[PDB]
Design a protein around this ligand. Sequence first.
Ligand SMILES: O=C(O)CCC(=O)c1ccccc1C(=O)O
Ligand SMILES: O=C(O)CCC(=O)c1ccccc1C(=O)O
Ligand SMILES: O=C(O)CCC(=O)c1ccccc1C(=O)O
Ligand SMILES: O=C(O)CCC(=O)c1ccccc1C(=O)O
Ligand SMILES: [Mg+2]
Ligand SMILES: [Mg+2]
Ligand SMILES: [Mg+2]
Ligand SMILES: [Mg+2]
Lengths: 367, 368, 367, 368
Amino acid sequence: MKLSGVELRRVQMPLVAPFRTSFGTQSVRELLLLRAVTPAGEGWGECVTMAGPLYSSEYNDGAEHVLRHYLIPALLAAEDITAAKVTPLLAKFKGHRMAKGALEMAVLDAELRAHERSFAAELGSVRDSVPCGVSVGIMDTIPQLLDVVGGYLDEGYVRIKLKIEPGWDVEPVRAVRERFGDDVLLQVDANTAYTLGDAPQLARLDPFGLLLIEQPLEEEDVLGHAELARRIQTPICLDESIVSARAAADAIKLGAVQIVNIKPGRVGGYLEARRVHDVCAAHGIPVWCGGMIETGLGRAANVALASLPNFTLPGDTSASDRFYKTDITEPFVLSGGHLPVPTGPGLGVAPIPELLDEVTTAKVWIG
Amino acid sequence: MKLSGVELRRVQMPLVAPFRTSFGTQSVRELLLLRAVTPAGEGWGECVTMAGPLYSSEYNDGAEHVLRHYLIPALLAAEDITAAKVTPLLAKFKGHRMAKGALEMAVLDAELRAHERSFAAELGSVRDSVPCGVSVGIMDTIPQLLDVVGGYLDEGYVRIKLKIEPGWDVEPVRAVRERFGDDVLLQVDANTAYTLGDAPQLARLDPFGLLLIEQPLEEEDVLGHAELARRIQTPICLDESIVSARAAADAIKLGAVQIVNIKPGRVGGYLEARRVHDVCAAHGIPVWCGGMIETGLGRAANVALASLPNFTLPGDTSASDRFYKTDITEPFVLSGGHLPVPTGPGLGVAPIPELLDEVTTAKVWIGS
Amino acid sequence: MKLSGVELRRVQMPLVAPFRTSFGTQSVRELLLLRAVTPAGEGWGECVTMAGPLYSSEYNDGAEHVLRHYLIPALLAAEDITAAKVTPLLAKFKGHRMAKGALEMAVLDAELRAHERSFAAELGSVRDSVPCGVSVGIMDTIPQLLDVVGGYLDEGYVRIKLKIEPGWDVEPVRAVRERFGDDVLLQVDANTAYTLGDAPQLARLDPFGLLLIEQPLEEEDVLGHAELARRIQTPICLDESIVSARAAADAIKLGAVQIVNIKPGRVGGYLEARRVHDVCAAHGIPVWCGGMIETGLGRAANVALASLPNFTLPGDTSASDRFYKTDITEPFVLSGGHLPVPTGPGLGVAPIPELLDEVTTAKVWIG
Amino acid sequence: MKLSGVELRRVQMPLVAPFRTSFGTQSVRELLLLRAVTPAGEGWGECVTMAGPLYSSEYNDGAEHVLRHYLIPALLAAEDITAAKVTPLLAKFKGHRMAKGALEMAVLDAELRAHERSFAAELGSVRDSVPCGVSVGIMDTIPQLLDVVGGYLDEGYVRIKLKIEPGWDVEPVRAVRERFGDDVLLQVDANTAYTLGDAPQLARLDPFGLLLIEQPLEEEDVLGHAELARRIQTPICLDESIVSARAAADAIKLGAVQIVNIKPGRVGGYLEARRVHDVCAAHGIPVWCGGMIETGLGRAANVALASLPNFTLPGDTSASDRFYKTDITEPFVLSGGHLPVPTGPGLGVAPIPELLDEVTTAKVWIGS
Ligand SMILES: O=C(O)CCC(=O)c1ccccc1C(=O)O
Ligand SMILES: O=C(O)CCC(=O)c1ccccc1C(=O)O
Ligand SMILES: O=C(O)CCC(=O)c1ccccc1C(=O)O
Ligand SMILES: O=C(O)CCC(=O)c1ccccc1C(=O)O
Ligand SMILES: [Mg+2]
Ligand SMILES: [Mg+2]
Ligand SMILES: [Mg+2]
Ligand SMILES: [Mg+2]
């Protein structure tokens, strides 16, 4: 293919209910989408960055900028474009994975459509449906939490993931376990909230049979994770830390992780995410699909991804409604706690134009 | 898709010139080919087993049986098939990687063709042509070897690989480095001919600046390879041992390998092969594409495979005429020490029937 | 000796009660037997391969072919023949351990009988009888299972070995411990059914005091086992993975095994078996005899072997009748949970022709 | 079998030329032979002890005692006796390996003779002849040495083992490399003469390309050896330290040795020895046959032993005439540098009594 141009749209979507993590609160979702245009057709890309630089250094505005000034142009200048070549083409630019990730996706979708192949086929899906779990935010009250949980479990959800924070650990957990039983699948996510020094505290969760603890320490603190693993019974799971397959392998080698969360944009692409998957598998490390409160675009890609053989744990692949009343594509609807893998070319999903426009806030065409 | 059936052919191809490795002397290639049939079209698979079980446990006759009585049947027995689903589907059957890889190849080619996608595109090619080295066998005389090597160099090959064996190590290497210089890419391949006890001998090649030593020990001796490496300056490269991406991660972590030879059939398929590639890259282990005296079919798949990013070392992806006078496909021709990556759907290549029919010794159709 | 020829028979023997492993259910046993011919006398060999390649890549038909076309002929061609030399002689052929093992066996038996030596004598026995355990399959129901242990227990079986699979671990075990007590000798055998990711589930067996867990993971995953062993209380036992004395050495070295199962056919012969034994011994690794539901032929040479000094744990040397109603040789009968080492030359057993022919499907001369 | 009794004998055979070691000069060897008596027939044994406790704490007279009073009785009181069973029988008695070894030897020889099997066969020889090297002592002077050496070289011996000690290391070695060439198989043996602290001195041989250095330090100093390995280029070889298979394993595991010297007596018998061989082999550790200046008796067993597959290095399995003018058995004669493995049952050799009685100094019968 040859790249004709990309259309950068800013989008804002209201969340059904406010989302609280260790970094803050979310009431609304500001996305960034790309519409890649090649001679044959279009492809869509969704960017996982958020308003500010709280999960990671990347934020919507910095993305747009790098995309606009550096990445996109870079692609426009080459003769042949292939999803795979995107990387090597954009390699001179340091970092900015979620943005490079976004570009890749659009390109890929377009590429996959042209050949009439689904994201799932390309990625190597072995399943047609994937078990879904859910991520529950920080509550203001235990009771209000128990409700929410109970709600999700009722919806058919297979696993409960609890956002945690210093001052919202053990109790919330104790509570859930106590009320909902030990049989539930429960895990926690600190989004880098603690320190090695907090070990005893975290060690306090031992007794609860949590599947994992996701990113307790900062992104850069791999050795610390390995140390912490030594001190707690709860399995370490890395999110933020995993910026690449190489990163995964290093972490695995150093004993800093036992289970891996795979976030495609985080790692800079669905292509890279597959490698990550492959690397983990090779080392016997289980993986699961992570989420970034995406529209049915990323959602659709994630679902395909998550049907890969090593994803042996339910992912943050929740139904559409968990965050949006009105999704910009056909909605994703839980069935038997599962979500179905799209069958169509590329994403197998596309924005409903009427719908898209409504929530569009900006638009730019780079040709 | 949904498997309609597979055609099993036995092909006999004579080598323009006999090939000698540590395990034997060969003058004729015996291959096993697969034409997999789907509602969407055909696909071609090539098996790397050879007559007997000398490089590994697998051999033509054995591969054929298992394919016939177990693997093929199992795929036929499925509602859906994808190259990606072939593995899980045949997982109940232990080993037989070469057979499975061959069957996977056929399916994959057919699938790719249906989507009008090329193997390289599927695998993730980043290059459009690849550097080719050549595999030189054990000679009867140094002088003879020197000439052969001389010629390949002349055709434009970018690196030389020498088959070695106790009693055909240092000399031959000395003689070549000596005659052709230090600037040539040179490496050797034992095909499991030595033992750890042989280190002092192997340590003898230290001074030649060899790119690597390929599989000095037996296939199962990973630890010995790690030990050996502590004992020699030449870099260890594994082939036989690398039966999977998992084998590869294991050896690397064990420090038993520094450079990996990727052989698709040996690892159970082009799909597995990519994983291996990816596993190596994440560990900083360079790879290069192994060869198995394939026809244009496997050759083409290999060329594509070899255009993947981590393949930073010339592979055994020689021109067709290195082995065969008349290939069964559009031959592969060296161009500036390179081979061009195939563009068409699937393999980007296919057998010329009369050509093929002529080399065919047996054929069978396995359906439901 | 001088090899005159070999007769390849195909035998079919019905199972008293269908046997279910994690690889499947078996009601009948097809075997491959070999009759080595020397100017002196004959020798018998049995091949542990089965119908399909489920435990290992080796299967009956596969074995027949290589014997026929490569192995048998290789020996015949040789001037002098020593069981010993067999190895060297067939070394050029990669893999094919089971096959090679049977052949060696057939040769050895001849050779021994010829020196009027028993298998046990040549192997270095120190005992005259051996404790016999029993391999219990996967059942459809726990009561079923329970009856079954119960029954074997009563016959006088010294130890219990339970086939497990995912979905048949903890419970079945909770069951026999709870019903049969804590003083019973209990161990499990997953035949490669689990993954490093399933550790937690296997950790669920820590509480039952099992003597071991036989091959929780795949054949090739040695490092996985070592890791695994770091995550569970139950001692690791390797079967499939132990293909040679070197293999054993390696596994030990890597901390991947604590006890080793010796399967003579799996390692390539009785001679190699001895070697494994020794290696294990030298490293303080207890060993025990494994079984592959053999005839009295295999059974007899196994009893011999199982009399070796390091065989410190009851092996799968059950009584003939455990599998077969009628055995082609003089059956093996449990006398106080033991079984008597054969005293005659070679195996010390022979097939009762009448009985053989009764169970023989095919025959072939190779000379 | 049933053991009927053992006749013990003291032998005294003069050495051709006095042999000097790091422990002392020898002019005459004083052995201790065994004649086990069965229903069937008789077997012979040979003890590796010497006059005094200098190589190890075991000595001829000490041996006699334990045998007589502890060992021999032990077996006599047993119903069934098997070479195999000999071990477990004598287990209650701590140490005395050389002694138990000789005993087992005697027993084994009887048993093998009974089944008309050779030692070789029992052990699993795969070869018919073995390559032989020789063990050269400390000379009082270079030329002396240089001379001796060349002598041995001439008679065809394949490898050279030099006896070393502080003050007799580098020089001797330097001289022989210098004089005879670099293509010569050369190793050294210190019989525990050095200390870790002497490493620098031993590091001084780095340059000579020695195959090995045998027992630089004390028997008990495994770790020392491992450290020492770290400090020198010459591969460590253990003898004294290798008292068993388990010992071998441990040493291996700790990185204390690269090649092992096998002394059937030292390890407690030919059976153990075999085990050590297997253990080494499973660890990729080459092994070689060690010598304790033995008659035609120990010499015949060794030779069979030494034909085991992992014996990839020439042993101290020199011809009878290296030490003895007149052996008590058909002498062993170098042929092309090799020695032929015995073909008859048991040792496939036996003494020649006048030869024998001429050398015997004592005799004792031990019975039930
Ligand atoms: O998308 C989902 O289903 C939940 C996403 C989630 O928990 C999350 C949302 C924003 C930033 C980080 C994370 C996280 O998983 O760490
Ligand atoms: O495909 C080629 O170009 C040569 C292949 C080769 O050298 C070879 C041929 C048969 C078996 C093993 C090997 C090898 O490379 O190890
Ligand atoms: O012969 C017996 O007593 C039964 C042995 C058995 O359970 C078995 C049968 C086939 C493959 C593997 C195994 C095993 O022991 O793991
Ligand atoms: O038997 C031989 O050939 C010589 C043996 C030898 O050198 C020796 C003699 C006495 C004690 C120890 C050793 C030794 O090899 O360590
Ligand atoms: Mg997270
Ligand atoms: Mg190779
Ligand atoms: Mg088992
Ligand atoms: Mg010595």
